[PDB]
């Protein structure tokens, strides 16, 4: 989960 959150931050 949190890895996907960071992924989402860095994609933005």
């Amino acid at each position: 989960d949190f890895q996907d959150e960071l992924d989402e931050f860095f994609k933005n």
């Epitope: 989960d1 949190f2 890895q3 996907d4 959150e5 931050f9 860095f10």
Partner: antibody, heavy 118, light 110 residues
């Protein structure tokens, strides 16, 4: 059999820059966010920054923004941290840490003593 | 968000039940709180994170709980190797930020 093998201890003069490294083995390096944490003598843990698995994205602690650079080398499975304008307050053990998907650090390097002193 | 741990030093006997407290400056979710153990001269070791999810190979005597600003790590029966320093850690993703409590020393009562 996760291995995070950090570069050796460093001594630095104030105002110098340092580059510390952490070589990963035993796991798929490019699947993991990697983090740097430091611990000054008899003090607590302090986050410095993270770098995403591709190496394209980093995020630094506000107290280190500007003076810290994170890089990773997919070819050597090696995490790097560079930190500039060192003062004696940066004397600390520097740890690389592998982030589990939960966001916690499931595996740590053995640490790198960086001594900053005139 | 800063984390403040209490007490600074907890003195217990092996076999006791230890509760270590982590206090966040503002409300956080337990899922973004992790607990680490560090023995002197060693790197920290993740114990428990989130709603009492124990790290791989962490025995069942380690648990964590809490809500709002109040979180706890419990060691239900202290082993000699459990006397160490314990750090809580909080993380957020937007923007990516990590922070640690200042550490609680778990000392042998005598």
């Amino acid at each position: 059999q996760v291995q995070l093998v950090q570069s050796g201890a460093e001594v630095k003069k104030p105002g110098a820059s340092m580059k510390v490294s952490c070589k990963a083995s035993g796991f798929t390096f490019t699947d993991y966010y990697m983090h740097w944490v430091r611990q000054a003598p008899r003090q607590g843990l302090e986050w410095m920054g993270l770098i995403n698995p591709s190496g394209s994205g980093t995020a630094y602690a506000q107290n280190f923004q500007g003076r810290v650079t994170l890089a990773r080398d997919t070819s050597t499975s090696t995490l790097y941290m560079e930190m500039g304008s060192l003062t004696s307050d940066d004397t600390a053990v520097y740890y690389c840490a592998r982030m589990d998907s939960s966001g916690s650090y499931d595996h740590w390097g053995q640490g790198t003593l960086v001594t900053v002193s005139s | 968000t800063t984390l403040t741990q209490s007490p600074g030093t907890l003195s217990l006997s092996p076999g006791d039940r230890a509760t270590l407290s982590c206090r966040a400056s503002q409300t956080i979710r337990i899922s973004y709180l992790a607990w680490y153990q560090q023995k002197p001269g060693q790197a920290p070791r993740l114990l428990v994170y989130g709603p009492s999810i124990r790290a791989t190979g962490i025995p069942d005597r380690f648990s964590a709980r809490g809500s709002g600003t109040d979180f706890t790590l419990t060691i239900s029966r202290l082993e000699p190797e459990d006397f160490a320093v314990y750090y809580c850690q909080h993380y957020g993703s937007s923007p990516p930020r990590y922070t640690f409590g200042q550490g609680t020393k778990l000392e042998i009562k005598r």
